Structure formats: C-alpha cells, structure tokens
Design an enzyme around this catalytic site. Sequence first.
Site: not given
Ligand code: ANP
Lengths: 298, 298
Positions: A137, A141-142, A155
């Site tokens: 993946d 975005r990841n 991710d």
């Molecule tokens: N370690 C981190 N530090 C800063 N931001 C983060 C971190 N991990 C996740 N985020 C952010 O928090 C938000 C949600 O992250 P995430 O758990 O990947 O859900 P998502 O990819 O945005 N949506 P989804 O895939 O449906 O859960 C997004 O803006 C991520 O980029």
Amino acid sequence: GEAPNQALLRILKETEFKKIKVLGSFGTVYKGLWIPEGEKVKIPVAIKEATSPKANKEILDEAYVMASVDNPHVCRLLGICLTSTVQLITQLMPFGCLLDYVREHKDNIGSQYLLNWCVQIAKGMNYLEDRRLVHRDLAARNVLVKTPQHVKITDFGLAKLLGAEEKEYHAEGGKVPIKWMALESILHRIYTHQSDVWSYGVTVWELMTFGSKPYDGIPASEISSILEKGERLPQPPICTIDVYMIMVKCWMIDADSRPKFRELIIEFSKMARDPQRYLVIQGDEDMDDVVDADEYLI
Amino acid sequence: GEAPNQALLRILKETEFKKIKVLGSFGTVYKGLWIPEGEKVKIPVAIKEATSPKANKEILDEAYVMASVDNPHVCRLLGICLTSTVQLITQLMPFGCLLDYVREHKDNIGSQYLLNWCVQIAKGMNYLEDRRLVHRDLAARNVLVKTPQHVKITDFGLAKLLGAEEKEYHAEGGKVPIKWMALESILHRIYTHQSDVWSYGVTVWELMTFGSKPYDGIPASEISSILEKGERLPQPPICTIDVYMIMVKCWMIDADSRPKFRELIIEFSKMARDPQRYLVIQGDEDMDDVVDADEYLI
Ligand SMILES: Nc1ncnc2c1ncn2[C@@H]1O[C@H](COP(=O)(O)OP(=O)(O)NP(=O)(O)O)[C@@H](O)[C@H]1O
Ligand SMILES: Nc1ncnc2c1ncn2[C@@H]1O[C@H](COP(=O)(O)OP(=O)(O)NP(=O)(O)O)[C@@H](O)[C@H]1O
C-alpha cells in the site's frame, strides 16, 4: 526455515502518556507526549485509539509488523497500550502525510527536496525488501514527514511478511487502492517487492505533480484495461525525461523488468547531486526534556 | 549460543578500482574510485594496502569485524582485494580523522557541531554494544569525517566480539593507548562496553578542547596512579558544568556507575537542541556516475 524475529513489543502504561490534541478521524489519532516513568524524557508521539474483535486483530497485526522493523525511513512503533480500546504509540511526524504536504507547499518545494524524498522512500522500501516484507500500500498518503528533509514510510495495515520460501503473496479478496497497484496485482492478486516498485513509481508521480490524483476521474473499474493497452500516467511538467524514464520502468508489465529499490536509490541519488539538471521547477531556490523517538532507544 | 553472523564479505577485483593519491603512511592508504563492473557507478573509496603472516592475520581480523557491522555511524567496509598484499576497501571519508579536523578548524567549530558529534559517536557505540562488540580503542583519532555534519567510528584493529556469555574481555598483553583507557583496563586488562564509555568520555574531552592531548606531558607510566588518587582530566573552557558532569561520570571508578551509550545519546541530544546553553564558544555562528557508498547497497 528463516531467522527468529526477536523484535521487542513494548507495552505502555496509560498513565505514562497524555493526549494533547486530535489529529485525525476510522478510530481517532492524537498528538501527545510519552513520558517513560523514571527516565527524564518526554517523547512526542502519535496515539491512535466500538470494539470489534476483527478491528483489534488488524491493529495488532499492524503493531506486529511495525515492531519488527527498524530503519531511518520506516515509521517506528514505540508501543501499544492495552486499554479497553487498544492504542498504538508511534513517533510523532509533525508535518503529516507527504501527499498533503506537497499540496500545501508547492510554491516552496524544490527539486533538491523532491529527489531526496524519492531517495529516502527507496531506502525505506529497499530495507523492507531486505526484511522480506511486502508493503502492498505504498503511496504518497502513506509517507509521513518528520522534517522536510526526513520522510518515513508508514501504514503497515496491508503489509505481508513473505513466508520462508514464499515469493509472491496471493491475497484473496479485498478493498485495495487500484490506482497504485501493479497489473499482476489487479488481475491476479499477486503481490511482490516488484509489485511495490510499481506503487513506488506512482508515488513518485504524485510527488512530481505536487499531489495530483492518478488517472484523475477514471473509474477504477477500467484502470485495468488501460494498462494492458500499453498506457500509463503522463510525464509531469517538471520532469526531465531522465526522471520520467524511471517512473515508466517502474510500470513495465514484466515485473522482473522493473528496477530494484536498491537501483532506484543509486539513480535518484545521482540526480540528487545536481537537482536542477533533472527537475525543472520555477524559481528553485516546558520541554527541556523533550527527546525525539529517534534518539530514544529501549 | 548466539545468532549466526550472516554478514557478506565481498571480494573485489583489482581491475575494479584505481588508486588516485596517497593519504597516509604502517602500510599505505590511498584515495581512489571503485567501479563495480557493469553497474554504472563510481564510489569514492579508501584503499589500504613486506608481507607478514601476522600482519595479514590482523588486517583480515579487522575486515571480519568491519564486515559484520552496518550503521550510519560506523565505518563501512566495501570489500577486500586478495592481491599479493591484501587491500581493505572502505568508504572514503573526505575530511579525515576528527582529531586533526577540530585542530584545523577550531575557529569555525560551533557548539551545534560539537554536540552533534557527541551524539553520533554515542549512537555508533550504542550500536556496537547492541552487536555485543567492544571497541577497545575509541578516541578522536579514530572517528572519521564524511561531512562536518556526519561522523563515523573506525579503526577496528583492537575490537573484540564478546563470546556467547562472555561479558568482559581479558586481553593478555599488548601495546595499548593508556590515556584513553578505563582503570579496570589498565590494572586488569579487562574490557567492557562500560570500559568503552570511559574512552568515550576522554574522546569527548578531546573534542571539547579542540584537540588537546590528554594528560599532556604525563608519562603513561604514572597515569594509573593519578586515576586512583581520584584525579581526572580538567573541565574544558567551553564546557558548562552540565557537559563536564557527563564526562566525569564516564570516568567513575565503578564501571556500572558510568552511563550507558543509550543514555549518552539522550543527554547530548537534549543539549543539541539548545547548543548555546551547554557550550560557550566565542562567536558561535568525469563524475556523473559518482555515488557515495552509503547509497550503494550489495
Ligand atoms: N505518526 C503520525 N504523526 C502525525 N500524523 C499522523 C501520524 N500517523 C497518522 N497521522 C495522521 O493522522 C490522520 C489519520 O491517519 P490514519 O490512521 O492513516 O488514517 P487515514 O489514512 O488518514 N484514513 P484511513 O486510512 O481511512 O484510516 C492523517 O492525517 C494521518 O496522516
Ligand atoms: N576511509 C578513510 N578516508 C579518509 N582517510 C582515511 C580513511 N581511513 C584512514 N584514513 C587516514 O589515513 C591515514 C592513516 O590511517 P590509519 O590506517 O588509521 O593509520 P594511522 O591511524 O594514521 N597510524 P597507525 O595507527 O600507526 O596505522 C590517517 O590520516 C587516517 O585518518
């Protein structure tokens, strides 16, 4: 068979950290501080918090993967807290996902940066390939931003550790992001490090176009057809043919014909020594005890 | 017993690289380029070249050690060439040993640098401790400069990989650099990661004094006496007590009372966020295919 995964899973006490603000909303993500007890340190961390036996299964699997990796370009998992709802504690990546970041800073993003990110991402992925791990993946975005000069892959919700002698992964049904997938993956649910290379290629394209959506407006339904026709994503405006050529190779139908991450590192590294030659962009140029997780070791 | 060292020893063809100039003169060291055949890359490398069965034994042992480590802060061994005289091929560190470098640039070395180096060196050593390896010869002369922002530990000519459950190393007679050795080492030829910490302490002192010689003018003969008297190296001019306190701890007679490298990382890391608070220094502020070894992977 293969080597013993002696990674360490650290279980964190909830008293040990405080959520400070919300970052996003699946479950819910927070920015906070982790203060191991008795060490004088405070670590900026990201905390990810109904309770579905299935959902727990997935997050635990992710924790398992993240706990097994250690590289400057892969997200580091600090621990999990086993409260009613499971919480994943990872290093706080201040500037968020890279996809949102190139979008929000197009007018300040130079070739030096773009190429460095392509380099770091390839190092991350090459490390993952060494650890016989297939991400499945990889996309802009990841990838999170620690600093504009330091990105890391994240991710691991779909990643698979290939078995002893298993060299392809045959998934059996899923909700998968088709616009970043290799053709073998779409037609035969087969995943490979080379399959990852394909996604690396699309990822680089997202960076080069400052956040454009692949095949914008084209139903995932037909994506598969297009690729067989011999079609691909278009050359981005800033891309010299040298860079674009690399993307296009990441998209060859014959997977063994695509480049290896370790090669992608060399190529983008070379180009990073003289950025302006490969990318043409307009106008190129308390907390006393806070410690970054990259400096906090077991 | 312990894990299988599956590191890879690469044997290089002499035709594959060319010496370009001399760097130093034991045997003889050169700067040159390594061009693996058929890869379009050129890698700046250092080439170290009578033939004594004993001498070969030592260099091969060193090669063995260097080939077993992989860390951004430890020197990387590219390979060996088995010509009449054995040659060690390592990454070229352009700015030479750090001892000569702080001496030659005192008027341009700021606290930000000094503290970053203390941090990187501790990361290197902490990595070595993880790999159950004891260096036994850590000193400023044994740290090379890739760039002023990136140093690495070198000279594995005395290092020992502790056995399965062996926790001290008992050498049996040697020509050892006494001014950087722990007291247990001097009196009982016992070496430990904590013994290394002592040398780390003296190393930091060399950096903080811009290259001064420890116990300048004091015969190694008596060094041992002095230490028992409760004496130590003096606080350097630029050192706030905070920094000096750390050195002094690296010099406690009780080895378990000294700090761990992983702690040294946190402490110097914190200080590195606000350099000016911990160190007070006057006026603080063809080759198209060249690839750095840090980007060339197997
Ligand atoms: N370690 C981190 N530090 C800063 N931001 C983060 C971190 N991990 C996740 N985020 C952010 O928090 C938000 C949600 O992250 P995430 O758990 O990947 O859900 P998502 O990819 O945005 N949506 P989804 O895939 O449906 O859960 C997004 O803006 C991520 O980029
Ligand atoms: N990889 C390298 N890149 C650049 N310079 C190096 C490298 N390795 C060694 N040197 C330098 O080459 C010279 C000799 O190095 P070395 O093999 O450590 O001998 P030495 O420590 O100077 N003297 P000795 O301990 O008696 O052999 C010194 O200037 C080293 O710092």
